[PDB]
Design a binder for this molecule. Structure first.
Ligand code: 2F0
Ligand code: 2F0
Ligand code: 2F0
Ligand code: 2F0
Ligand code: IMP
Ligand code: IMP
Ligand code: IMP
Ligand code: IMP
Lengths: 351, 355, 352, 348
């Protein structure tokens, strides 16, 4: 059987910069469109934005800000169970907001989940590097079996086989993304990954047939990518780098060459793990952006504008009807502003 | 439930831009100086050259519109001013020598009031400028202007699809403007993620517009004279330039020394600065910047036309109709683009038509 | 007939940096291969390369050294009729070596050629921006009629139909290249051109039916490009930028930031056209690093060809033209092809 | 006129063109097997071979490589006496596996004799063009004299060359024409085949004869090695990623507060000391002891095989799938839009 040998290089992948959204007939202004989205009856959002579960991205103050903006925050797991449980309770006491918490496939996973459920968390996030693993699937089964009503976000995966496997396991929402992270080196050190736009589209295609929403995680640098991700089949996107510079992100502002910066690093980086192994991430920094409200406004505003061009009144019409168009690298250069000295920065370009 | 066929066509379309192709040479019986660059937009509108200056606050006002018209082209006076002022600019150009002049109009409730003054100032064409030309507000506005002014030249845009062009034409538009996101100072494709590669956009719109005997305008993306030849060869009747005109003397704005030499301010109309003056929080779709000073407009126009004449000479095109209907392209890679530009040599002197 | 409108973006073109020559079975060592080429009964070269007819590339001194290496030189036409016919004879009297001279499509074209024939050139180059035009077509007919046995090299062209046109006009050698020049902007200011390698392959395809040789003109920056051009069907290549740093080339040495340089400019540049706000140039002017004698540069070029032919197993250029295969690669391949992830300490005699 | 129309048909791929597609896994990365068997006389515990160059592999490197489960190839830019001594030096350092480079020359068989007497485990017939009649005749000459000897001949990049070379009597085929970090062969000769395609085309032919192949050149990250192995290679050979370690020949030089070591191609002017070089000369960063580089290399392999659901290198060789991407894909694959503060032990 040469089926496997003769099909090693057949597949093709696309990402955000390979593609443009084709404008269609619009009977709706950007301010008129609806950006609401539903993961489940117990989990509904006013904006399709979820902050990443990372030690440099989301804690108590970040989750409260995201929820009050209409989004969701996933509290990272690089803390004790008691700490994460009382961080969830802190967010819930802050006005009955929505909040999530990250959990890993370990031995104390169910022990941590108990406290999170005891803290009345809305959704736990089973975060692993390879979501198509047997341990992950088996772990999801244990959770659903004990908590039939609890929202379970399982990831990360990048194929249809993996999405189906987790859906049958019992996951309500499937997080998609192997490699596209701004601080990720998984595709560099392991040589493993799938281009994000193709990944989201492939995983959605399977998940769309189960009534299962998918999360576009990592890879988004501009507002336009979020629109591309949602139109590719995603119900909601997850951001790390664009939320790291935000004031409400966990961290103290440092100074580099006079400017204000915030520490942003991978969970698979050396620094994050220590708090010798082979890292699948790096340690870096992003400019301080101020309050979250300004970043959200630029992001959501870009989505509204994008939905307006496609004639999409709401997010579902976008997924069902939006058409992309492929372009070369030369098209990307035309897409970006070109051949002009940039006097000053825009609040949506670069960040 | 549903059975979606649109789902499997999400990534089937692919688009080309200027740096993706080259014009293939052909048998030629005409010298570059012998060719014709004249075009017809409508019965009442005719240009000797395929150049139109963009309706931007940093590109086209009276002095620009006058200079452009005297070169054989057309100038679209921007709408970032009062209705009276705009009508005054249109009058100033019309009086100068019976020169042609255009005016930019947005889809507002003030639109008809603005157009009334423009027509009274004897404007030759109005441009219905909007980020999304395939919109109801635009289409409905075209109907309303065509009804009240049955003989007024209406330029409608911007669109990037064939269905949109067809929609504008049936709304009563004389000319269709094509270009979503290729602008030098544009970030629409970056902040909204929406667009079509300009050469593909121009070509597809021209395919639909051909059916109705309607001309189209290639707007944005042009950074060299060769790009203009491609746009016209793609099927466009006329090109619209913003960045190559902004550094010209007649353009609005004073000169400023940056990086050791003279520069002129050039910004996108969807940028912060270009809208905070006509506002009294937004998400911009353009940036603010500056382009190098290039002196009188005549020098720029001569380079553009000359490059067009050479390109038409390589193709054997005695006129622009033969160019649109006969010219062939050839798709190349990024490696082909590097070969096309000068390479492996330190350029010591600045060329009139390069960098 | 909506065919012409629908067949607008069908064609795809390849340049040198899109392909690699696939190695083949070899029973011949690189030093054993034959690099000799036959353009005509009267024009035979030991090595397959010609110095371009430009005012910063080829005059008498360059033409002589080029011919002593087994190549050919084309005296540029940026000089009076007397000046060109003069230093053509200057080459013709430094041995029995060969020499060429560029001629334009003017009202006094025939007058210049007559002086060159009296100076006894081996080949004239009817050179123009657009070879596929009646002005050039009827000019070749004129020369071919007056001089039945004169080697006529017409160009430039980039399509098979154009190559066919020049051959039937009277040209026995066709020069290929519309815009791949290093000092060229024709592609940028006119939007016109064909990716050189595909241009050579298309032109050679048609020209081969008539037994007519093809010159791969322009677009060569490394010796590997030459091997690809010859393998693409070309008999001989023509160089400009690689011959300008050579001492024998016209112009004097300029020093920039501690290094020696020599002026290299396009014949369509503003500087070239001024000598002989007006016109629109299709070329630029600049400088290239001084290389020294022609012998050193020409040794690295042929050496690359000999190695390249050895990999493909070609004993002579004919076997290379008839059998050598390519393989396309993306931008990721091109970067792998060049040195990478290693900080170069010294310049190599044949790399950058 | 079929050979004329065939010229521009083929398409090639390299490491930066694709990504490995993650598959269902029941295995942890630390549990996977990275052992490999080239021949019954030559078995490696890790799929890493130190390249036979004068800036990469000598006695000190070959010993350190062998103790990690890898292999070292002593370069032949030295006398027959010296190379045989280096071979004997590694062998008397605990009976470690050693390899030695041999070229196609007059003193070829003479050199091989001295290496055989020094009990070399494998000889590498290292040539620029493996598909030449000279190398083929040389392999035939060597195999006839030493039936039980391991012969690694190269380099090739086609299935034709691999077949003709296996028929010559070689046990291992080394693949790679031009992918080298210090190589200019594709630039100066215009000849080459994209490594990942070359490995695939060669391994396709080779496995029909049950013959292993070496992926030689082009690797800049551990992920590339995983790709090379998943393309059909039994084992890879590294130059630049080893030239900076402490066990490599050459001493640390210093430039602007960062340590470097010399690394140049064997086809460069320096290593060949008019000559027409097919390589350049330069320097790579100093990376301390070999065990740190190797740890990252293998650890990255285990991660890859983990994602692919591969329990051993044979599974990865027969089942792993690739997905093709553009330049934008590669941009997304590497970190982006974030100013890297400190360097990872496995990333630049
Ligand atoms: C998100 C992420 N990678 O994408 C990450 C986060 C923390 C640690 C790590 C580390 C431990 C460095 N990498 C890691 O666990 N990789 C890995 C690779 C392959 C498999 Cl099969 C597994 C696994 N345990 O399933 C894990 C990775
Ligand atoms: C020309 C241009 N964009 O190309 C532009 C000009 C001024 C403001 C703007 C701003 C206000 C920033 N954006 C804007 O009008 N966006 C937009 C997006 C989508 C739609 Cl459907 C619409 C619309 N109302 O047609 C407008 C854009
Ligand atoms: C080689 C080359 N251009 O690529 C060149 C050389 C000298 C002058 C020129 C100038 C005069 C600047 N350009 C030029 O003659 N271009 C040109 C363009 C199109 C045609 Cl159809 C013609 C022509 N007369 O055939 C010439 C160009
Ligand atoms: C490894 C390598 N090239 O990849 C190399 C090593 C040393 C010298 C050389 C030199 C001498 C510079 N080149 C070389 O042998 N080239 C070459 C080219 C073509 C052939 Cl057919 C041959 C050959 N005789 O096999 C050799 C190359
Ligand atoms: O250390 C890492 N290695 C690989 N992926 C990571 C790592 N840390 C975070 N990620 C992923 O990348 C996402 C953020 O990527 P970003 O949106 O490009 O900033 C996170 O939500 C995770 O899914
Ligand atoms: O701010 C903006 N955002 C997006 N497009 C713009 C903006 N302002 C002007 N444009 C378009 O871009 C064109 C100029 O493109 P350019 O000639 O390539 O500089 C104008 O004629 C408009 O069609
Ligand atoms: O100014 C010019 N414009 C366009 N092509 C030129 C010009 N000058 C020289 N060329 C062509 O470019 C060739 C040199 O290309 P190079 O070898 O890549 O430097 C010449 O032999 C001519 O065919
Ligand atoms: O100078 C040379 N010219 C061409 N290839 C070379 C030369 N020197 C070494 N190589 C090859 O390149 C490999 C190293 O490439 P790297 O692993 O990418 O550094 C070696 O193992 C050889 O196969």
């Amino acid at each position: 059987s040469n089926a496997m040998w003769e099909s090693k290089f057949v597949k093709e992948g696309l990402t955000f910069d390979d593609v443009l959204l084709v404008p269609a007939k619009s009977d709706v202004l950007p301010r008129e469109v609806s950006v609401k989205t539903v993961l489940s009856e117990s989990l509904q959002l006013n904006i399709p934005l979820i902050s990443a579960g990372m030690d440099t991205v989301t804690e108590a103050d970040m989750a409260i800000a995201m929820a009050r903006q209409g989004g969701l925050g996933i509290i990272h797991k690089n803390m004790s169970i008691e700490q994460q449980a009382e961080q969830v309770d802190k967010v819930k006491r802050s006005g009955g907001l929505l909040v999530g918490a990250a959990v890993g496939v370990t031995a104390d996973a169910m022990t941590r989940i108990d406290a999170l459920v005891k803290a009345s968390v809305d959704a736990i996030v089973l975060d692993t590097a390879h979501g198509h693993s047997q341990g992950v699937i088996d772990k999801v089964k244990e959770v659903r079996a004990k908590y039939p009503s609890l929202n379970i976000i399982a990831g990360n995966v990048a194929t249809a086989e993996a999405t189906k496997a987790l859906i049958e396991a019992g996951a309500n929402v499937v997080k998609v993304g192997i490699g596209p992270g701004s601080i990720c080196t998984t595709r560099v050190v392991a040589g493993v990954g799938v281009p994000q736009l193709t990944a989201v589209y492939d995983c959605a295609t399977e998940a769309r047939k189960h009534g299962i929403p998918v999360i576009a995680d990592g890879g988004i640098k501009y507002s336009g990518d979020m629109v591309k991700a949602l139109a590719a089949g995603a119900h909601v996107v997850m951001l790390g780098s664009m939320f790291a510079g935000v004031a409400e992100s966990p961290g103290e502002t440092e100074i580099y060459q006079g400017r204000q910066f915030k520490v942003y690093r991978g969970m698979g980086s050396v620094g994050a793990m220590e708090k010798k192994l082979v890292p699948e991430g790096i340690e870096g920094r992003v400019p301080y952006k101020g309050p979250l409200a300004d970043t959200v406004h630029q992001l959501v505003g870009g989505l509204r504008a994008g939905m307006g061009y496609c004639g999409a009144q709401d997010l579902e019409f976008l997924r069902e009807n939006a058409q992309f168009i492929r372009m070369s690298g030369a098209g990307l250069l035309e897409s970006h502003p070109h051949h002009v000295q940039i006097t000053k920065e825009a609040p949506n370009y670069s960040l």
